[PDB]
Design a protein around this ligand. Structure first.
Ligand SMILES: *C(=N)Cn1c(N2Cc3ccccc3C2)c(Cc2cc(F)c(F)c(F)c2)c(=O)n(-c2cncc(C)c2)c1=O
Ligand SMILES: *C(=N)Cn1c(N2Cc3ccccc3C2)c(Cc2cc(F)c(F)c(F)c2)c(=O)n(-c2cncc(C)c2)c1=O
Lengths: 296, 297
């Protein structure tokens, strides 16, 4: 099992650079709007205590340098939605894919196209941690890099990168500018919550093992969902939602192993602790049910 | 600290489907040529024991259906080793600046897995010492390519031909020469004994330090020769002085001498990791090059 990213071409053709004064970052050019972190309107000194509504009333269209490579796109309007700036430009991007904006749930994976100075540099898969951070690989200059899934040539944008936190993990927003997690776009004492294991994905990984004939850990037991959730938390595992149970349905059907039967199996692995699964001693939690199917 | 592939856009616009009869796979369209595995000309029966010069002479241009998202008309064909080259009537307008390179064992590249001419996923792989690669390829992935990108120039280094019985992958360069002792015939084929890419493990241990993980370091040193004795014992590749040189930047950056890191690795091979993990792994990772680490650290 490999972490496979989606082909990045469709997103590559949407990446631009946005500059306010000396502050620069990446933006995303879809039709005639460029989306980017609103913190582009800040000097580094302003970050210590920014008032965005004011910094923005005082900006004008002509203050924003938007560039696709070295070609300037003239801005004809500006607004902010939550923590994202939307710059209306005078050119509709001919390379705009079919797209939507999605707000993903913790556990969901997506591809990150890391970008510097509007120029894509690399692509990799990432999971949204339960504590609403991502364990990304971002260097300074990466703000405005985006995360996405691709579903029949429709690009679902789910993440825009804003910042690195103290412990070296990453935080940002959806494409409506709403942060994942409790973070804010100003310099404070902010820290990631204590993280937990993504139970839904661990179960998907157990289904993957079963599909491949690796099924020693299956037992005769079943559990109630409520009982499972209470025990799981004792081992720093996430409780399951109804949505989780549902996205495990296809793998449940493929293997004929009921979700709550697999939960029983997991509970035992937790209570006794293991002997390998898919030739690994560790339970993997960054492959979703959809990832498992997409690979097998 | 993740495996990071190159952005795949420039390659995506070169992928096409090639079909002969009910045999289909992917092709790479550059200028007015489509490169694909020559085994496209075989039925399953032919593929059991193919005489390719003899099969190819019997084909006409119109036997080849090339599809680019538009049918492209084939106007000429030739074979170069295990790669078929179909000249087509239309030049690919999105051809990047490109080269064909043969990679060295230990080196990494991005794979763009494709099915029916359509890109499906992108990830990094290394060319293993035994000249296989551990890809994520399913049925129909033949003709998917591997590449590196340097300032907009795409260097293609791999074209995918088969999965071996063990679940690893084998293929050719873009000149159609196999990596490893394999052939393009349906017969059971094993690779030689694989070994671990030592220089890469060392690069990855340096990565782990740069990312704030230091539990495996020790105060000890070793000579190159004595390290290599231990490494060969554990089916690791020899570390050369050129490798030590290559590691110079990461050594400079962490203030750990290469031979000091080698002493750490020796202890890891001898003692195991006990309970522990390094950059999330329970296993010593060997598929990041020094260059890959630098490009990210
Ligand atoms: C983003 N492309 C640059 N950057 C920043 N910033 C530098 C800067 C300069 C002027 C004005 C604002 C900024 C932000 C940060 C810092 C940052 C980001 C926020 F959202 C905040 F709310 C904040 F208080 C500070 C940053 O963390 N990174 C970053 C992202 N990912 C990885 C790394 C190593 C660094 C930036 O790139
Ligand atoms: C490739 N897109 C199809 N394929 C093949 N082949 C199926 C087929 C049908 C008719 C004629 C020729 C072929 C080859 C193989 C089999 C194969 C190919 C070789 F070159 C060999 F030397 C060999 F021993 C076997 C194949 O392995 N894969 C493949 C690739 N990667 C992963 C998986 C699961 C399968 C094909 O896709």
């Amino acid at each position: 099992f490999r972490k496979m990213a989606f082909p990045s071409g469709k997103v590559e053709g949407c990446m631009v650079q946005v500059t306010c004064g000396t502050t620069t970052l990446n933006g995303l050019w879809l039709d005639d709007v460029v989306y980017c972190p609103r913190h582009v309107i800040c000097t580094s000194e302003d970050m210590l205590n920014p008032n965005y509504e004011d910094l923005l009333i005082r900006k004008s269209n002509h203050n924003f340098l938007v560039q696709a490579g070295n070609v300037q796109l003239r801005v004809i309007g500006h607004s902010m939605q939550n923590c994202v700036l939307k710059l209306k430009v005078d050119t509709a991007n001919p390379k705009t894919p079919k797209y939507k904006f999605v707000r993903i749930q913790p556990g969901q994976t997506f591809s990150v196209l890391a970008c510097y100075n509007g120029s894509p540099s690399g692509v990799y898969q990432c999971a949204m941690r339960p504590n609403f951070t991502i364990k990304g690989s971002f260097l300074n200059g990466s703000c405005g890099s985006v995360g996405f899934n691709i579903d029949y040539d429709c690009v679902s944008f789910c993440y825009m990168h804003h910042m690195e936190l103290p412990t070296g993990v990453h935080a940002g927003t959806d494409l409506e500018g709403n942060f994942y997690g409790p973070f804010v776009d100003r310099q404070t004492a902010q820290a990631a919550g204590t993280d937990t294991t993504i139970t839904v994905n661990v179960l998907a990984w157990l289904y993957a093992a079963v599909i491949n004939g690796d099924r020693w850990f299956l037992n005769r037991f079943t559990t109630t969902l409520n009982d499972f959730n209470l025990v799981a938390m004792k081992y720093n595992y996430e409780p399951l939602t109804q949505d989780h149970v549902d996205i495990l349905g296809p793998l449940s059907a493929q293997t004929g192993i009921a979700v709550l039967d697999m939960c029983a199996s997991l509970k035992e692995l937790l209570q006794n602790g293991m002997r390998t699964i898919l030739g690994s001693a560790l339970l993997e939690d960054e492959f979703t049910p959809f990832d498992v199917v997409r690979q097998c």
